[PDB]
Ligand binder design. Structure first.
Ligand code: CLA
Ligand code: CLA
Ligand code: CLA
Ligand code: CLA
Ligand code: CLA
Ligand code: CLA
Ligand SMILES: CCCCCCCCCCCCCCCCCC(=O)OC[C@H](CO[C@@H]1O[C@H](CO)[C@H](O)[C@H](O)[C@H]1O)OC(=O)CCCCCCCCCCCCCCCCC
Ligand SMILES: CC(=O)O[C@H]1CC(C)(C)C(=C=C/C(C)=C/C=C/C(C)=C/C=C/C=C(C)/C=C/C=C(C)/C=C/[C@@]23O[C@]2(C)C[C@@H](O)CC3(C)C)[C@](C)(O)C1
Ligand code: KC1
Ligand code: KC1
Ligand SMILES: CC1=C(C#C/C(C)=C/C=C/C(C)=C/C=C/C=C(C)/C=C/C=C(C)/C=C/[C@@]23O[C@]2(C)C[C@@H](O)CC3(C)C)C(C)(C)C[C@H](O)C1
Lengths: 177, 185, 159, 161, 98
């Protein structure tokens, strides 16, 4: 009967920037009010980019720890030293160049979306594969992407911290604490 | 009469007027034999901060109520493990010094308490009125009638005030004695 | 509330102290919901007390990194120090995901937790007979489980 | 609830109870549960016979741990030899089917009908479609009884047969 | 534009207007200050979850216009020239080819 109360934090009203967006109006989690201080479109873009980066990085860490390697003796290093070894090897610089060109295109997308020159949704790059045709299907698919991205972000955080703390491959089950 | 935060929040903010009551008509003053409006230093005369002060009083009482129960239970049971055994940390008070910093236990408690506080901080400053001060929607056993709601509100405040004072003795008596739960010499 | 199930036959409205003799539908809603949930938990608890002693001790290792297998741990009050506290934390956290989630409810019914483990809506007096039977079984389980736990405190364990 | 799909010979509206009280949803639910086992039991029965006579047993199953797909003991003894990682991947994948593709339980959809362009059948109209539907139902319960017979024979003696 | 729904009211009706918003935020008082950098300071009437961005408003057009300023142009060109000279010196030191 009063404020549109946030579902996540029941004692804090939902921020108006969370209306009509993916995720958002199912949980409305924003107690610190970051959406009240920054554009919701930019926050959503950053969230989706972080989710995708983490979903790739978590699986990369899993594959590297479990023993999957490229057929080169230069890659016979642990996942912890993989970054430094490959930075000194060269491929990290090339990966950075390629991610740089892709991020130049992403920056153009953001600039042309925030200025309204295009009609782009925050995280949309045009890729429409396995995307439901029905609008509710699209909304719930975007929900699934967001949930998986957030889960992978937290999971990769834990994986990196535990791997550094205990020299051990991904499952960390044995360990000692 | 416990308006839900959903609507109660529509009358929140720094009130610039005076109710004319003791502390803007807030619970905690009614004593046993009558009223015991206490404030002798006139802190409640700064009526703009009365919702804030009540929030601080409730927050302190809630921490102290757990904290006093904190110093009691370790003296009779401890978490299953060697780091918390009665031989590694004999008395309860030597826990902030033992389990802290690089150890991990206290540091994690600091972080997750920080996360909760940084999330429930917008309720302390914004959305905090003389009506929804300390109300975090967790009203399960709250009575429905107005007068009984006042008793439970009065019950929490008196218990919180007591624990605040009781905890002060608890650490002071324990530190000067190094003794189990009854901190008498 | 003289029709909200629970009044099967051996006794009618069993409210000696009159703890629900005021008409507070909110308090009764809380009381019935907690009553039903306790029946459900005691039903699983009593089943969890009898079986590991009788048979069925789970095959593998509870904590392979500590060698502890399900057979080794005791059955009853006393296992709370043998099941690792991390395991107890997982037991609490999972049941949280099933009590405050997967089964979090409001403005629906007494204890109609929605999902559940299949979404299924019945009809007819058969619902009444089954639902009353569930309350009767839960009441017996609640009495039984405190009996098993209290006895084991003053009888050790097993026979 | 006596003239819907399951009206075979050697029995018609087979009662022992559990069919009265006139609940359309229960028939829509139990029959779905009936077919969902049939589509499972048929595969469960076939998976219990084909790696005994045909004996394809191709390649390797867990190259890290060996566990060649030829040395796996057929039957109930198999759930122990196949790595638990593999069993988890089987359950998790079938969950994806159960909740994302070919098993999204749309309520307007029929008792056992959804997107089924991925094999199974995608016919139309009725008559022969209904007789095929009764064929699916009839085979499933034959398989349902058979597979538990295979399990009981397996666990009791020493192996599947 | 950014306050399409604020129920913005003038000082003269500070205690008169009460219709809150499309949200439940109370009406905000607009004070017309004479500063050009802050032409209008908005004051609240109560607790509100108002979306006030702290980020600036920049656009590609005037950022490019700033980079088209003679300082930026003649600094980018001279920086590239100096860097090219340094790179040539690194790659062909001591002008051995001469
Ligand atoms: C890079 C990290 C990152 C970023 C930028 C976002 C951004 C966002 N999240 Mg989010 N989230 C993340 C990680 C992140 N998320 C992770 C790891 C989880 C799992 C716990 C979640 C779980 C989550 C939920 C459950 C919800 C959001 C929501 C939102 C949106 C509003 C919240 C807000 O004001 O900004 C958040 C700003 C930060 C987190 C910055 C980090 C602050 C520190 C310094 C916004 C688009 C809400 C939404 O969908 O509405 C649009 C919502 O209900 N998030
Ligand atoms: C969904 C995410 C997720 C999950 C499933 C787990 C799960 C687990 N963590 Mg973990 N963790 C997470 C996120 C997560 N964590 C994050 C975000 C951090 C901070 C970066 C950590 C930091 C962390 C530490 C420091 C440790 C764990 C440990 C553990 C294990 C106990 C358990 C398997 C412990 C462990 O594996 O023991 C060696 C342990 O020591 N976690
Ligand atoms: C003597 C102890 C005591 C008492 C009487 C209360 C009483 C109250 N608390 Mg409270 N509280 C306490 C300790 C206590 N608290 C502690 C130690 C904490 C810290 C975890 C809290 C944290 C807390 C929150 C976050 C909130 C309350 C709220 C409330 C009110 C409604 C809930 C209710 O009636 O159930 C409590 C009644 C009981 C019998 C429980 C006691 C269990 C022992 C009520 C006046 C809510 C409120 O202000 O709503 C108006 C609210 O949002 N309390
Ligand atoms: C948490 C447990 C719990 C709860 C919340 C309820 C709640 C309820 N029961 Mg119920 N019941 C229970 C356990 C419980 N019961 C058990 C174990 C039995 C078996 C004896 C019954 C048998 C029973 C019958 C036969 C009937 C009810 C009915 C009711 C409803 C109205 C009566 C009332 O006001 O009770 C309020 C609940 C309480 C006051 C519970 C307080 C119990 C205290 C805390 C302890 C009791 C003694 C305990 C064993 C001491 C432990 C010893 C240890 C401390 C040393 C109400 C919703 C009636 C109904 O259906 O109404 C329509 C009805 O006819 N109950
Ligand atoms: C409130 C419910 C409850 C609780 C807290 C427990 C708690 C426990 N059970 Mg248990 N159990 C329960 C219900 C419960 N059970 C039920 C309903 C059954 C019947 C299927 C069992 C059958 C059972 C067996 C056969 C074994 C345990 C065991 C255990 C202990 C090790 C944890 C474990 O692997 O549990 C597993 C519990 C489940 C998977 C729940 C289903 C732990 C003390 C082990 C033990 O040594 O007992 C002391 C063990 O081998 N449980
Ligand atoms: C047209 C002039 C010019 C040319 C042809 C180059 C060419 C080169 N520079 Mg260079 N550079 C220039 C201007 C130039 N730079 C200027 C003005 C600066 C500012 C101080 C630099 C600072 C710079 C650094 C710090 C480094 C290079 C490096 C390099 C080499 C690798 C490419 C690279 O990192 O891009 C250079 C990037 C830019 C020019 C963008 C600046 C923003 C490459 C031969 C790298 C090298 O030696 O590779 C091993 C290296 O570490 N340059
Ligand atoms: C590497 C640089 C990365 C830092 C900049 C990344 C964020 C740039 C912000 C962005 O592009 O959108 C922010 C702005 C869009 O800003 C738009 O500006 C409009 C002006 O009419 C209105 O104010 C719109 O409300 C506002 O969205 O995009 C720019 O053009 C940025 C130019 C590049 C800045 C460097
Ligand atoms: C060493 C040695 O030689 O010993 C051998 C022994 C042996 C036995 C031979 C072995 C074997 C073979 C096997 C694998 C035997 C398996 C038996 C199974 C799978 C039984 C499952 C029953 C599921 C049921 C009833 C689900 C039922 C679902 C029901 C009832 C639903 C019931 C509803 O009430 C609910 C839930 C809601 C109601 O409203 C409606 C209805 C439908 C009634 C061993 C273990 O390998 C080794
Ligand atoms: C798929 C998610 C998942 C994983 C991946 C996982 C993994 C591990 N669980 Mg867990 N678990 C659940 C989910 C998962 N568990 C759920 C839903 C429950 C129901 C409540 C549950 C219960 C218990 C209990 C009772 C114990 C337990 C433990 C371990 C353990 C051992 C560590 C080790 O080998 O050292 C590992 C690796 C035992 C333990 O010893 O924990 C220290 C133990 O006591 N678990
Ligand atoms: C396309 C994605 C995909 C990848 C990338 C992948 C990878 C691996 N699978 Mg998997 N898999 C599926 C998909 C994928 N699997 C699907 C849809 C199913 C049916 C539901 C399935 C079933 C099994 C089974 C039954 C086993 C199995 C295994 C391994 C294994 C071994 C590692 C090692 O031995 O080096 C690796 C690398 C074996 C195992 O032991 O895993 C540890 C084993 O037993 N898989
Ligand atoms: C963190 C840390 C530690 C610590 C600590 C901590 C948290 C210490 C905390 C100490 C604390 C919390 C000390 C409170 C005192 C409160 C007092 C004295 C109140 C008096 C009030 C008085 C005397 C008067 C009260 C009344 O007048 C009132 C108000 C009204 C009258 O009607 C009734 C009376 C007259 C009775 C360790 C564990 C010690 C060592 C470790 O290494 C480092």
């Amino acid at each position: 009967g009063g404020y549109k109360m946030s579902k996540a934090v029941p004692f804090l009203p939902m921020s108006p920037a969370l209306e009509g967006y993916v995720g958002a109006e199912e949980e409305g989690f924003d107690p610190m009010g970051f959406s009240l201080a920054l554009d919701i479109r930019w926050l959503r873009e950053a969230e989706l980019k972080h989710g995708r980066i983490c979903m790739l990085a978590t699986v990369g860490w899993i594959a590297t720890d479990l023993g999957m390697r490229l057929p080169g003796p230069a890659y016979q290093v642990s996942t912890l030293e993989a970054h430094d070894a490959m930075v000194k090897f060269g491929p990290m610089a090339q990966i950075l160049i390629w991610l740089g060109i892709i991020e130049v295109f992403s920056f153009l997308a953001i600039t042309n979306m925030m200025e309204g020159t295009t009609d782009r949704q925050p995280g949309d790059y045009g890729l429409r594969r396995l995307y439901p045709k029905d609008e509710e299907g699209q909304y719930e698919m975007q929900l699934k992407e967001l949930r998986n991205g957030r889960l992978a972000m937290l999971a990769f955080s834990g994986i990196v911290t535990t791997a550094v703390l205990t020299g051990r491959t991904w499952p960390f089950x044995x360990x000692x604490x | 009469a416990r308006r839900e935060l959903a609507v109660a929040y529509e009358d929140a903010g720094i009130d610039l007027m005076d109710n004319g009551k003791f502390a803007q008509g807030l619970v905690g003053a009614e004593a046993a034999f009558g009223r015991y409006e206490f404030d002798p230093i006139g802190f409640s005369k700064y009526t703009e901060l009365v919702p804030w002060f009540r929030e601080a009083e409730l927050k302190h009482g809630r921490i102290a109520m757990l904290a006093w129960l904190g110093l009691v239970v370790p003296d009779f049971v401890r978490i299953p493990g060697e780091a918390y055994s009665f031989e590694a940390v004999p008395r309860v008070i030597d826990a902030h010094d033992a389990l802290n910093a690089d150890a991990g236990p206290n540091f994690q408690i600091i972080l997750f308490i920080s996360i909760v506080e940084l999330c429930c901080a917008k309720k302390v400053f914004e959305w905090n009125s003389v009506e929804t001060a300390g109300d975090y929607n967790l009203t399960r056993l709250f009575p429905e009638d107005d007068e009984a709601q006042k008793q439970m509100r009065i019950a929490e405040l008196k218990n919180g005030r007591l624990a605040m004072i009781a905890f002060g003795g608890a650490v002071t008596q324990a530190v000067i004695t190094g003794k189990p739960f009854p901190w008498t010499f | 509330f003289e029709n909200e199930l629970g009044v099967q036959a051996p006794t009618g409205f069993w409210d000696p102290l009159g703890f629900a003799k005021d008409g507070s539908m909110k308090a009764f809603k809380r009381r019935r919901a907690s009553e039903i949930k306790h029946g459900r938990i005691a039903m699983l608890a009593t089943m969890g007390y009898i079986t590991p002693e009788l048979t069925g001790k789970f095959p593998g290792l509870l904590s392979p990194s500590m060698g502890l297998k399900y057979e080794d741990i005791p059955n009853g009050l006393g296992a709370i120090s043998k099941v690792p506290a991390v395991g107890w934390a997982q037991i609490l956290a999972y049941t949280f995901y099933c009590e405050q989630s997967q089964d979090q409810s409001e403005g629906s019914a007494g204890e109609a937790g929605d999902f559940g483990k299949v979404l299924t809506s019945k009809d007819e007096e058969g619902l009444k007979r089954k639902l009353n039977s569930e309350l009767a079984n839960g009441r017996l389980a609640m009495m039984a489980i405190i009996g098993m736990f209290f006895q084991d405190g003053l009888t050790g364990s097993a026979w | 609830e006596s003239e819907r799909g399951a009206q075979p010979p050697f029995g018609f509206w087979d009662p022992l109870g559990l069919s009265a009280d006139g609940d359309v949803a229960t028939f829509k639910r139990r029959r779905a549960s009936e077919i969902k086992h049939g589509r499972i039991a048929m595969l469960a029965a076939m998976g219990y016979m084909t790696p005994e006579i045909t004996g394809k047993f191709p390649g390797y199953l867990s190259p890290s741990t060996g566990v060649k797909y030829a040395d796996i003991p057929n039957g109930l003894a198999a759930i122990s030899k196949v790595p638990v990682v593999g069993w988890l991947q089987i359950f998790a994948w079938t969950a994806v089917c159960e909740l994302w593709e070919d098993q999204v339980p749309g309520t307007p959809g029929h008792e056992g009908e959804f997107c089924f362009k991925a094999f199974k059948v995608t016919s139309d109209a009725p008559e022969t479609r209904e007789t095929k539907l009764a064929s699916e139902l009839a085979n499933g319960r034959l398989a349902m009884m058979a597979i538990i017979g295979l399990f009981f024979q397996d666990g009791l003696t020493g192996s599947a047969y | 534009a950014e306050t399409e729904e604020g129920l913005i009211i003038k000082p003269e009706e500070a205690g008169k207007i009460t219709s809150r918003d499309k949200n439940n935020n109370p009406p905000r008082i607009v004070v017309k200050t004479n500063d050009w950098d802050i032409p209008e300071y908005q004051l609240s009437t109560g607790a509100s979850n108002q979306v006030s961005y702290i980020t600036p408003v920049v656009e590609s057009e005037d950022i490019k216009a700033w980079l088209s300023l003679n300082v930026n142009f003649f600094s980018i060109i001279i920086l590239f020239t100096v860097g090219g000279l340094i790179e040539i010196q690194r790659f062909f030191p001591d002008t051995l080819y001469w």
